[PDB]
Design a protein around this nucleic acid. Structure first.
Lengths: 367, 367
DNA sequence: AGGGTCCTAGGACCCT
DNA sequence: AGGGTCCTAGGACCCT
């Protein structure tokens, strides 16, 4: 029942893609901006103090030299994202996408195969690729250390192939479940990998400074927990399972408390093709008229290109607006499944009439 | 793009099953009761005035001779229901279940096969099995009349097999879509079949006396339509598509108005195994204590037997209560997927604590 | 921002 | 009653 999981986490993905386009952008600090927010920056910029999602002003304050670059159109990032997932699917088919720049792979079946092909004398010659978390000592007769080290060898092969075949650097973390692989992938953060041996699991989770930092524990469950006096990982570990049950639920409770201990039995899901296709347009209260139809015609403009090129067809469209958000959705008529936009704009226009700073159209329920 | 669909509608299903158990119950009027309500009755009882869902009192008023029989445990009905669906799946695999006693089958691929095997001279020798709606005249050079007549021959073979192999009588309606097949299956109502030729589609839908009677038009959309002055099928046919769009939605609108015309492009779905397993317990305010745990232990008692024997395992449980209803659900822990009830009662007990005349537990999200 | 994921609790519909 | 179906609109989570 042992598992070997790798978390692959590309460095400043958007920046990497832009720096590939215009090679001149390298060397100097680089921000990728979405409206008034630098969402991503290359290492240089990050050394100068440009932080994740920093105002284009505060960016130009710690870093007047910034060479900013617009990244509101995610097409090129989305395409490279899937080129990376597909490269990893070639290693082992079971790859889970988390956002655009992170992937989980279950290396278990693959690690086991590489061992039965390996020979007796090799077992002692097994080496780690990259760092070992907390410099922990390897025990070459621990079957679990050997598998995690083979896992680190596969992880380094993936990272080498991502660079060689797509020009992308990134980090990797090798552990026995998704939680720990993701928590250890970032220990050595620029284009490196780390492997976690079980004896250091507690050191790793306790290296966190607030249950905020546990993936699966967002703002809501965080502030909720902070209202029970739970703040450190150890607090959540020792807190009453009972009060937690009745406070957050039976679902949230035991999952969160197990994450507290480094436990995470959740399987690596095959992400396969997307379950949805959305696009967003925000503006300085630019919508209060039939302009919404010029936008929406534009949002949907590029989508129909996307949702078509995919192959499958959506059987539901949705329209989203900001003024918390609201949505009104409807099934896509059969006739409209196969010129469109005359019929589709109309669909979403009446969805729009039923219901302005944001505006989005999402194609979902694909078949 | 022509379709041949059969709607199979067993007569007083519950009664049929009971009359099979204790053959003595035949001959005399028979009611199947659920609390203070005769939900089903054999033809005899129905001749005496016992109507669908009639008080056990009003039942014993038009029909003091009633020989009532309890039918709150649906196990035996549910089992025969699936024996009937499986018999029809043998004819053609694509069978859609609607409730326990109704099934749709798409006979198109099957009718077409029977024709290419049939010979030239036979085409004129094709006959209808059962009634033709509105006594309409057959045109043996109308390819659509011939296919619907082959459809009627398959329908009669199914009904003969349901009787011969399961002892069940029932009705059948043969049409070109689901709506019309279901509307015509009941024209000759006791253990007979009817076929609808297209030239009589309008006669059939206009034979209805209120859009209430169109399947897919329930109480809500009905009263809504009745507020627009729409009452007859012709009203809905001629009513403004536009006002209907803005009143009921773009989804409801065109689907409802097409049903008005006898149009229904919806495909026959393969129902396959159930998507859920529920059981219900209602009582005269009998629950206001740890009794709910004695019930719930009992509701869930039989379910775990059911949801297990199926094979797949649910990955969500739900608890439902009446005091409109309310539900609180949660994922079923991995450990509990495989003794249970010690863990499961507890799960639903805390779901119960979070939230008494009704009480139910439902196992859903099966895999 | 711009973009995803899956769940949940209520609601409509079908049948008896 | 006792039992099903699928949808929807909001909400939580992940990433930038």
């Amino acid at each position: 029942s042992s598992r070997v999981i790798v978390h692959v986490d590309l460095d400043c993905f958007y920046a990497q893609v832009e720096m590939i386009s215009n090679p001149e952008l390298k060397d100097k600090p680089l921000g990728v901006q979405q409206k008034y927010l630098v969402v991503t920056c290359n290492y240089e910029a990050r050394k100068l103090g440009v932080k994740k999602l920093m105002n284009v002003r505060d960016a130009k304050e710690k870093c007047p030299q910034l060479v900013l670059v617009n990244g509101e159109d995610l097409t090129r990032y989305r395409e490279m994202s899937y080129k990376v997932t597909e490269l990893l699917e070639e290693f082992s088919p079971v790859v889970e996408r988390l956002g655009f720049d992170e992937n989980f792979v279950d290396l278990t079946e693959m690690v086991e195969k590489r061992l039965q092909q390996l020979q007796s004398d090799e077992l002692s010659a097994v080496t780690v690729s990259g760092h070992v978390y907390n410099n922990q000592s390897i025990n070459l007769l621990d079957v679990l250390h050997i598998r995690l080290l083979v896992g680190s060898q596969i992880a380094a092969e993936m990272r080498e192939a991502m660079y060689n075949q797509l020009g992308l650097t990134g980090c990797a973390g090798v552990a026995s479940n998704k939680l720990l692989a993701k928590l250890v992938s970032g220990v050595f953060k620029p284009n490196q990998q780390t492997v976690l041996l079980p004896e250091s699991c507690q050191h790793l989770i306790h290296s966190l400074n607030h249950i905020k930092e546990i993936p699966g524990i967002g703002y809501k469950t965080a502030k909720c927990l902070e209202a029970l006096g739970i703040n450190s990982v150890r607090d959540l570990q020792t807190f009453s399972p009972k009060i937690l049950e009745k406070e957050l639920g039976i679902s949230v409770a035991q999952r969160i408390q197990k994450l507290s201990f480094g436990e995470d039995n959740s399987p690596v899901i095959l992400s396969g093709p997307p379950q949805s296709f959305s696009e967003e347009d925000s503006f300085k209260k630019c919508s209060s008229e039939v302009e919404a139809k010029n936008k929406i015609e534009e949002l949907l403009a590029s989508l129909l290109n996307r949702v078509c090129q995919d192959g499958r067809k959506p059987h539901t469209v949705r329209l989203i607006i900001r003024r918390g958000r609201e949505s009104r959705q409807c099934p896509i008529p059969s006739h409209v499944i196969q010129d469109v936009m005359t019929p589709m704009v109309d669909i979403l226009m009446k969805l729009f009439r039923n219901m302005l700073t944001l505006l989005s159209v999402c194609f979902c329920n694909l078949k």
